Structures are given as C-alpha cells and as structure tokens.
Design a protein around this ligand. Structure first.
Ligand SMILES: NC(=O)c1ccc[n+]([C@@H]2O[C@H](COP(=O)([O-])OP(=O)(O)OC[C@H]3O[C@@H](n4cnc5c(N)ncnc54)[C@H](OP(=O)(O)O)[C@@H]3O)[C@@H](O)[C@H]2O)c1
Length: 319
C-alpha cells in the first residue's frame, strides 16, 4: 500500500478525521481537502501520526471544480465524504449533488482506481410504503417526495447525491462503491461538535428534557472509517453497504448514558407514551460482515463519545 495516494474530501470532519488517521497509520499518502488549510479547526490533522511526511491539506470547495482537479490529480483513490449536514435545502442540496458530480468527474479525469462515497441510511430507510417487517438492507431506497414533503432535506440531499454518483460514475466509467452509515458516534478528533454527536450531547447537558418514542440505528466512527478503507481495498467490493451495529430505542440510549454518567441531567421521562414502545426494526449488515468487518458494540461507543466531550471541554461535571 506504500506509494499509494488517496484523496479524502472534507478531511477535518468527524468521520473523515478518523479515516485520515487510519489511512496514515496504514501507510497511505493522503491529500485531504479542507476549505482553509490555515484554519485552526484543522490543526488536529497536522498532529496525526505520519501527517508531517504524508498528509497534504489541499484547499478546496465542493463547488470549485478546479480546486478538486488540483486535489485529486495523481490520486489512486478518492474517499468522497465531504457534505453539508443540514435540513436547510439552501445549504444542503448543491454541495451534496453538484459537489458529488464534481468529485466523480475530477476522479474520472485523474484516472483514479476507485471512488468510495459516503452516503447515509437517510438514502435507504425513508420510504412510507415499505412494509414495517421487511429487513432494511442495501436494496432499500428512500422516497424523495416523502423526504421533501416531510422536510427531511438532509436525507433528500444524501439520496439525490448518491443517485447522482452512480449516474455520473456509470457515464464516466468510474469504479464507485458506496457506504451508507447510520447515526455515527464515538470520540471526536476535531475541536467542535458535529451534528451526529449533538444527538448525544443534548442528553448530557440536559437540553433534552424527555426522550422520544422512537428507535434508530447506531455505529461507531472507527468502524465507519475502517469500513471505508475495506471497501476501497477489496477488489470485489461492489454496490452499496449498510454500515450499522444495532438499533436502539431512545429509552435504551438514555439508560446506557445515565448508568455510565449518573451525575448528569440525562432525561428519564418519555415524551409521549400514548403509543406502545417502538420496537427495533430489522436490518442486515451482512455485506460488510462478509468482507470481515467486526462492529464495536454501541455501549462502548456511547461511553467514548461522552468521555471525548468531557476531554474537550463540552461537559463539566454539574455542581
Ligand atoms: N455523522 C453521521 O452520523 C453520519 C451518518 C451517515 C452519513 N454521514 C455522512 O458522513 C460524511 C461526513 O460527515 P460528518 O458526520 O463527519 O460531519 P462533519 O464533521 O460536519 O463533516 C462534514 C465535512 O464536510 C465539509 N463540507 C461541507 N460543505 C463543504 C463544501 N461546500 N466544500 C467542501 N467541504 C465541505 C465540512 O467542512 P467545513 O467544516 O469547512 O464546513 C466538514 O468537514 C457526510 O457525507 C455525511 O453526510 C454522517
């Protein structure tokens, strides 16, 4: 793997920082794109093992095609992870969809071996019709109008970006593999708190006063990073890959948190118990397991998320 060069888009982000860290540990040369290499929020990347010799931070934006050409030039592979993470369609849609087309086109011109695209469970799950008992897997796609009508614009953007990626890759003859993570937790390498981790932080700060009657899937950030690498490196990898460890009710989540962190104002009350407690849905992560990926149990992952938030100043012990 020595002498191999890969681009990671949006390299200073939550998932991408772990991806860059592990790529460098494995011996890769990495060209990580960030909007401003001199911004202190990217400083953690420079301090990674191997970064001094093998990490270049390339100034780029998803909507600046030439900047992407410069970053991707000479790469063997591209991990396209950069995206807005927002339900504001004015912020979400163009960098997701046009940005993704731009990345695939730059990768095609650079003659890269493979692109791995970070999609989401949001591109898989959000289908009104799908029977509740059906196993959620890679054959499932979300309903766009439904995402649109429910103002799930983040899910819409990820889905349409994924569709654009397949379409453009097909047209340009690019080997594309897609990973679809569920909600990602784990320790943060970066200084700020990204969207997925806010979902845990709100319980520890007590800004969340109750927990909803709902379930969703969780996965550890280190597993997600390893999975991106596994999809790049395995010649036979093909299509989409659901990346998820287990599904938990929010009630289960706050129980785990409150047992680990009894000093914090984690909510104990369900928002609304008018309906029976929602049961975890069935899913398959067999595709990734079949490639050898082992998933870290969610409890460990949640614990490490809070310890990280504490280290980084976000959770002083209450008085
Ligand atoms: N965390 C999860 O639960 C989860 C689950 C499924 C999928 N994903 C996907 O995982 C990927 C990474 O997200 P994340 O959770 O790690 O969030 P994150 O920390 O917010 O990372 C997103 C990165 O994308 C960037 N970016 C946004 N717009 C850009 C643009 N126009 N040009 C260049 N870079 C841009 C960011 O840069 P700036 O900091 O400069 O804005 C940021 O580094 C995304 O594709 C996301 O949709 C995440």
């Amino acid at each position: 793997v020595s002498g191999q060069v890969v681009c990671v888009t949006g390299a200073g982000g939550f998932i991408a920082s772990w991806l860059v860290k592990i790529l460098l540990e494995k011996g890769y040369t990495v060209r990580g794109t960030v909007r401003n290499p001199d911004d202190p929020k990217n400083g953690h990347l420079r301090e990674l093992e191997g970064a001094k010799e093998r990490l270049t931070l390339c100034k780029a934006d998803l909507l600046d095609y030439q900047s992407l050409r410069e970053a991707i030039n000479g790469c063997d592979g591209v991990f396209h992870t950069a995206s807005p993470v927002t339900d504001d369609p004015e912020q979400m849609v163009e960098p997701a969809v046009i940005g993704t087309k731009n990345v695939i086109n730059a990768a095609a011109e650079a003659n890269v071996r493979r692109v791995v695209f970070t999609s989401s469970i949001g591109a898989v799950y959000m289908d009104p019709n799908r029977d509740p008992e059906t196993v959620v897997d890679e054959t499932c796609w979300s309903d766009p109008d439904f995402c649109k009508n429910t103002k799930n614009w983040y899910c819409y953007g990820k889905m349409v970006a994924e569709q654009a990626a397949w379409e453009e890759a097909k047209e340009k003859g690019v080997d594309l593999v897609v990973i679809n993570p569920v909600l990602v937790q784990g320790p943060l390498l970066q200084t700020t708190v990204n969207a997925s981790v806010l979902h845990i932080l709100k319980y520890l700060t007590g800004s969340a006063k109750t927990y909803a009657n709902s379930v969703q899937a969780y996965v550890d950030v280190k597993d997600v990073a390893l999975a991106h690498i596994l999809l790049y490196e395995t010649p036979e990898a093909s299509g989409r890959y659901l990346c998820a460890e287990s599904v938990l009710h929010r009630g289960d989540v706050v129980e785990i948190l409150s047992k680990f962190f009894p000093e914090y104002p984690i909510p104990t009350k369900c928002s609304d118990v008018t309906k029976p407690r929602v049961k975890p849905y069935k899913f398959s992560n067999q595709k990734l397991k079949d490639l050898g990926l082992e998933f870290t149990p969610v409890k460990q992952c949640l614990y490490e998320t809070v310890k990280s938030l504490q280290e980084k100043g976000h959770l002083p012990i209450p008085t």
